[PDB]
Amino acid sequence: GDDYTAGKEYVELSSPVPVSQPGKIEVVELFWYGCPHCYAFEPTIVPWSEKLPADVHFVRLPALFGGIWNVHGQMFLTLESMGVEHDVHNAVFEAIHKEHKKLATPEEMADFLAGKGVDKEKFLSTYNSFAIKGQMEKAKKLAMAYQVTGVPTMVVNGKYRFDIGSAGGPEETLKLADYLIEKERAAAKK
């Protein structure tokens, strides 16, 4: 009969946000190019996310809160729109937190991406296109609605907000995530 405290481990939003399509549970993690905590979470969240059933869907959304925040995230959405899969996405975080070659401009981004199999022309073509902007505004209005006041931040079904600090550790974050998945799943368990 329960095992977590509201506000202590996970915080429930007074104003919840509905997902686009029902049936599957929404799991969003708002990472940033300036959060070290997100880097140490990668080798821990991957084995969990890539082992989830066909009832849970993880989404990669950056902390687009204007300023330099949105700038340090658009690059990711650009790659996802390129149609590349299993292109060693983790290598990107490496050049950001291990090297930190000031990836704040498209030039530096393309220069680095070109070394892993990325066309500078395609990149810049869609980068400066509305195709990415439509995604940017989409995540922007959702991020602030998910009550994301920090990074990282795991949001489940736009109702429960938690993170490493709130949970009490990277492992505790996974505990809360799995618990909340069943929490929402129970509201529609046939």
Ligand SMILES: Cc1ccccc1CSc1nncn1N
């Ligand atoms: C918000 C966006 C931008 C880019 C890729 C995927 C998405 C859809 S993810 C989403 N849409 N409504 C709720 N939710 N978490």
